[PDB]
Amino acid sequence: YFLSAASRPLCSGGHASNKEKEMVFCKLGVLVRHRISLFGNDATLHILGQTLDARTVMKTGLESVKFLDNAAEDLEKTMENLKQGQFTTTVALLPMLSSLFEHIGQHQFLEDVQVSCYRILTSLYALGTSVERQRSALGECLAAFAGAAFLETHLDKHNIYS
Numbered sequence: 001y002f003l004s005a006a007s008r009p010l011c012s013g014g015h016a017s018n019k020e021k022e023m024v025f026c027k028l029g030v031l032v033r034h035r036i037s038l039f040g041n042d043a044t045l046h047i048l049g050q051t052l053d054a055r056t057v058m059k060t061g062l063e064s065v066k067f068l069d070n071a072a073e074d075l076e077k078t079m080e081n082l083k084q085g086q087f088t089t090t091v092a093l094l095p096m097l098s099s100l101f102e103h104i105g106q107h108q109f110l111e112d113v114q115v116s117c118y119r120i121l122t123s124l125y126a127l128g129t130s131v132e133r134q135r136s137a138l139g140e141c142l143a144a145f146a147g148a149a150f151l152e153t154h155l156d157k158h159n160i161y162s
Contacts, residue, residue, distance in 0.1 A: 009047050012054035019061035031073035038076060041083035049092055056095035063102035071112035078119035085126035093131040100137035107144035114153040117141065121159035128162065135160065
């Protein structure tokens with residue numbers, strides 16, 4: 001019932017423990033976190049946005065290693081955040097300033113960081129089915145993708161222009 005939504009709030013603190021597990025064997029545990037969140041996105045209001053703010057702290061620890069199989073499975077976790085955006089205040093736009101500035105550091109990397117933005121392009125497709133400086137910082141990811149396999153993050157730059 002509503003205890004399962006409180007179990008999602010308690011699992012966001014368990015995802016904050018997975019942020020400590022992503023600091024260090026635990027890379028296959030992030031691949032299990034993607035398949036379990038994909039079924040939890042098929043399973044699905046301010047505590048759920050705070051669980052996405054606790055997932056923004058989990059995205060801050062995941063931006064440090066952007067191994068490569070965990071970042072490729074993070075695309076399956078970002079496609080789960082797209083279906084979690086297909087399930088439906090100013091702290092969620094602060095999470096967009098941490099994920100767009102980490103895309104400029106992701107320009108040094110390899111295809112798994114572009115796969116995480118290709119599935120986050122479906123999160124922009126699901127937010128359209130449902131703060132402007134983060135889209136201008138997402139327009140910096142357009143110069144990071146189209147300057148140099150190059151069409152994967154370029155299609156994500158078309159959904160980042162919205």
